[PDB]
Amino acid sequence: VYQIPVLSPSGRRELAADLPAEINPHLLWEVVRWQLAKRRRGTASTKTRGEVAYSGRKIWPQKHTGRARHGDIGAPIFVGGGVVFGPKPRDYSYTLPKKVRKKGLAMAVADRAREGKLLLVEAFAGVNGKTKEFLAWAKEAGLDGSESVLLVTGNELVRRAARNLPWVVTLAPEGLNVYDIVRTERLVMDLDAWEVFQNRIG
Amino acid sequence: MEAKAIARYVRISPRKVRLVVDLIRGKSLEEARNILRYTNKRGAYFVAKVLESAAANAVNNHDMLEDRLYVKAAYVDEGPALKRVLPRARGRADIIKKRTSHITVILGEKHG
Amino acid sequence: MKLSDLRPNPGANKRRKRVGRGPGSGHGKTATRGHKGQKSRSGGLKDPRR
Amino acid sequence: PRAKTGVVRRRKHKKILKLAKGYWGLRSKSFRKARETLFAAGNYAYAHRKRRKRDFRRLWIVRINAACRQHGLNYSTFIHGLKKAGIEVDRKNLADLAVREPQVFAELVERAKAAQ
Amino acid sequence: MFAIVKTGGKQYRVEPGLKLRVEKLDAEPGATVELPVLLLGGEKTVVGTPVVEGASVVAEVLGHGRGKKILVSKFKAKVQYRRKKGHRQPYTELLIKEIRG
RNA sequence: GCCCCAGGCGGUAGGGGAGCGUUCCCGAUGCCGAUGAAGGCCGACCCGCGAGGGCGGCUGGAGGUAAGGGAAGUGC
RNA sequence: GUGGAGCCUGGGAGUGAGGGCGCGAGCGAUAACGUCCGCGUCCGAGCGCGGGAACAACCGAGACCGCCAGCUAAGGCCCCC
RNA sequence: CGUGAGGGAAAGGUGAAAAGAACCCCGGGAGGGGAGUGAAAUAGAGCCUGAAACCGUGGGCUUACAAGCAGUCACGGCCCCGGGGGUUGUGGCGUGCCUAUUGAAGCAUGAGCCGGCGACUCACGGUCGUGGGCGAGCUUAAGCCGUUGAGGCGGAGGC
């Protein structure tokens, strides 16, 4: 359905290609919320009135002191006292449904693809592990740098030779995710990563 | 021109010395000098030193005619109170505020 | 479609019902708990089901 | 994340206080007393909006009643006349005529007793 | 020559060359309007009954404004009832062009 | 059919809806910023119904951060 | 009889100290700003508005807002007003 | 602080650089004024900014026959900015706020004022609704594999 450009020394081939023809933006929204959620450290800690380092001794008697009634200074109402309902060690991860993750991933790829910002690649004959290699390639490959592009492939000589690029986002094919696909204007993949993509939406 | 001297951090009640300083506001310099010299008030001394000091500043530093000098405007800001404890009856303690005062004198050459 | 275009469906997400934030919210001074009573106290009632 | 009060509380207090400029004593200095006095000033503003109309109507009936009594008839008689006389001019413009147009208002009384 | 007219359920004494705010009329700025004249006050002091028969004033609208923000703020006591409410009553600023007999 | 038609609009407990603002994540290797950020003081100026927002003036001297979403130690 | 009417199905409630007034009763002393009920109303929650001088429930009347417009309600029209 | 076991504080910030103010003057000194350093010194060490409470100092209005929950409406006067802003002399109206109450202006409770902290959450289950996915199917946990912010596998198990 989505005829995909394929750069190579043999010119520009294409693919058909099968993708979800319709984009459901709410779904990609939910999936991105998933990825961002589950990668939170959740290290926000506090100290309740039992966790705080004070004592349990009543500061002054209940009655006849004139002062207002209080228990321990560690209570949440004293400056220095513990916090009520403060954040605790909390896991924000959660299992988003697999059909939803896979489906939404395919829908992101359909977004950048059907919007022309997808570019599979057959090979990286230019790049050989040095950055300027990948630069002169990419400009040679029809790229300026204004398009933050998601580069996906299994060639560590390529990814390693293009990490330092600010406008390039490195990924091996396994790390393909909806979030990074939305982060980038244009998307680029190797045909092998194309295959693992297909198998990942099998 | 206006000269000015300031007794910054004068250990004395501000409210007390304000009564003194409010007695020489708008006076000629000689007048205020004499009035200070014979006013039965502890603050009158500090007002005196600040007064003459302001005269020296008006003469040497700002170079004003000492004859036309008068107290154009003076006042007493309050300073950092020194908190001390007064042991009161039955164990309880008070906290007296040994108040410090800032004195400001401001001199002009009255004309005519 | 970039990230700023990602929005949940209208109503897919929803605010909470924050209480004790004054009279303007209408949920103020009581957190809906009404006036005095065992149910209004912190911790609340016993098992209402039983 | 913690969200301390920061700047919100201070800005709100300064809002209320700028509303409270010109109030006696702490009512223009303390945010609390300022708030309270602003409540009373709000209800007063409302009720006195609803009041001022009745008030000026009272003034209008007063002045009109005087000017009409300078021509023999009283307020109720004049009103009854103009009402019968098929005239719709209201208490405000009647008053302003009686103070400004003794001859025009005089003509109004003319049609007024003319109503009888 | 003045005259009392009516607009927005109100009665205004007016004279030519006068800027007069009224209710928010429906008329483009620069447009002109003839008005119901309650009474012609002047030499031929004719009394509109209830309106002057052939007379009516002409006034080109100067433009629609919004009154100063009246801050209507109700408050009940001991009930947690506070109602702050901005407000700006629109108006039609006018100029008395003339008074047609 | 954004506008017109009719009707309604006191309000506690309470139920519901709709927004404002605070800290922090994405936007952001971005953008604003010494020609001055945040912050403070001031405005009779503009926006909003309001929560508030701009904008302006002075202080301040170095951070701030959009649209659009998310998460709360969120409004005294 | 189209009404912020009705019914059903679900979620969330609060309320479960009421009070005054009228009427019909009990108790009481045919006393109580009393108590206890029924019918109703108002307040509660309408200490928003006019009158009753002042006054929650008595009389009028249900406060979306603005207007330096008009007509009335109870109540008033000798001055305050 | 407590015999003691034990309780338990407050308290950060100049400046890029001390360049930390020589020296003069007043002063017993302190402190101050000059000078000087400095981008800046109301950045001067009691030091980033510096709010409010509070305190005073100058100016504008106003006030000594006068009644008041402090306001609000009108009018007038004055002053200021150029139609507005400040003050209120008069007249009208007007029983603080919160809670708790049938009922509070209440002579019921709380609060001296200001500034800051301060209270409906989280987890895991259930139930209702809802936004989406799939649908007589739905769906994974532990763990495994990967990056080291990348996810996938994992059907055990549950409904």
Swiss-Prot record, chain A:
Cellular component GO terms, alphabetically?
ribonucleoprotein complex; ribosome
For this UniProt record, give its keywords in alphabetical order, as a comma-separated list: Ribonucleoprotein, Ribosomal protein, RNA-binding, rRNA-binding
- GO molecular function, a single term: rRNA binding
> Organism's domain of life?
Bacteria
**GO BP terms:** translation
- PTM statement from Swiss-Prot or TrEMBL: The N-terminus is blocked.
InterPro entries associated with the record: Ribosomal_uL4 (IPR002136), Ribosomal_uL4-like (IPR013005), Ribosomal_uL4_dom_sf (IPR023574)
Chain ranges passing through the membrane = none
Query: Record's family?
Result: Belongs to the universal ribosomal protein uL4 family.
Q: Which PANTHER family match?
A: 50S RIBOSOMAL PROTEIN L4, LARGE RIBOSOMAL SUBUNIT PROTEIN UL4M
Q: State the oligomer form and interacting partners.
A: Part of the 50S ribosomal subunit.
What this chain does, per the record?
One of the primary rRNA binding proteins, this protein initially binds near the 5'-end of the 23S rRNA. It is important during the early stages of 50S assembly. It makes multiple contacts with different domains of the 23S rRNA in the assembled 50S subunit and ribosome. Forms part of the polypeptide exit tunnel.
Entry protein name:
Large ribosomal subunit protein uL4
Q: Which gene encodes it?
A: rplD
Swiss-Prot record, chain B:
Key word Nucleus present: no
A Gene Ontology molecular function term for this protein is: structural constituent of ribosome
Q: What's the name of its gene?
A: rplV
Q: How does it assemble?
A: Part of the 50S ribosomal subunit.
Q: What role does this protein play? A: This protein binds specifically to 23S rRNA; its binding is stimulated by other ribosomal proteins, e.g. L4, L17, and L20. It is important during the early stages of 50S assembly. It makes multiple contacts with different domains of the 23S rRNA in the assembled 50S subunit and ribosome. The globular domain of the protein is one of the proteins that surrounds the polypeptide exit tunnel on the outside of the subunit, while an extended beta-hairpin is found that penetrates into the center of the 70S ribosome. This extension seems to form part of the wall of the exit tunnel.
Concerning PROSITE patterns, the annotation shows: RIBOSOMAL_L22 (PS00464)
- Biological-process GO terms, alphabetical: translation
Task: Name the species this protein comes from.
Answer: Thermus thermophilus (strain ATCC 27634 / DSM 579 / HB8)
- Protein name according to UniProt: Large ribosomal subunit protein uL22
Keywords annotated in UniProt: Ribonucleoprotein, Ribosomal protein, RNA-binding, rRNA-binding
UniProtKB/Swiss-Prot annotation, chain C:
Does this entry carry the keyword Transit peptide?
Answer: no
A GO BP term here is: translation
| Ranges annotated as biased composition (Basic residues) | 30-39
Could you name the domain of life of the organism this protein comes from? Bacteria
Q: Which GO terms describe its molecular function?
A: rRNA binding; structural constituent of ribosome
* Region of interest: Disordered: 1-50
Q: What Gene Ontology cellular-component terms does the record carry?
A: cytosolic large ribosomal subunit
Compositionally biased spans, kind Basic and acidic residues: 44-50
* Signal sequence extent: none
Q: Does the keyword Ribosomal protein apply?
A: yes
Q: Which UniProt keywords apply?
A: Ribonucleoprotein, Ribosomal protein, RNA-binding, rRNA-binding
Family affiliation: Belongs to the universal ribosomal protein uL15 family.
What interactions and quaternary structure are annotated?
A: Part of the 50S ribosomal subunit.
Job of this protein:
Binds to the 23S rRNA.
State the protein's name.
Large ribosomal subunit protein uL15
Portion held of the full protein: 1 to 50 of 150
UniProtKB/Swiss-Prot annotation, chain D:
> Where is it found, in Gene Ontology cellular component terms?
ribonucleoprotein complex; ribosome
A single Gene Ontology MF term assigned here is: rRNA binding
What keywords are annotated for this sequence in UniProt? Ribonucleoprotein, Ribosomal protein, RNA-binding, rRNA-binding
Q: Which Pfam families match?
A: Ribosomal_L20 (PF00453)
Choose any GO biological process term that the UniProt entry carries and state it.
Answer: ribosomal large subunit assembly
Q: Which InterPro entries match?
A: Ribosomal_bL20, RIBOSOMAL_L20_CS, Ribosomal_protein_bL20_C
Keyword RNA-binding on this protein?
yes
The UniProt entry, under Gene3D superfamilies, shows: 6.10.160.10, Ribosomal protein L20 (1.10.1900.20)
- Please give the function described in this protein's UniProt entry: Binds directly to 23S ribosomal RNA and is necessary for the in vitro assembly process of the 50S ribosomal subunit. It is not involved in the protein synthesizing functions of that subunit.
Q: What family name appears in the similarity comment?
A: Belongs to the bacterial ribosomal protein bL20 family.
Q: What is this protein called?
A: Large ribosomal subunit protein bL20
Q: Which gene encodes it?
A: rplT
